[PDB]
Design a protein around this ligand. Sequence first.
Ligand SMILES: [Zn+2]
Ligand SMILES: [Zn+2]
Length: 41
Amino acid sequence: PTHRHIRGEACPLPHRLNSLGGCRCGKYPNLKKPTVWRRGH
Ligand SMILES: [Zn+2]
Ligand SMILES: [Zn+2]
């Protein structure tokens, strides 16, 4: 799938973010920001 950027995080890989801007696998919580769909990289 497409991984989301929380806008200014230096790419949250290799963790997979959902629509709330975080990864259920402990690393990124529910920040809820205008998250950008990035998968061109
Ligand atoms: Zn990225
Ligand atoms: Zn994670």
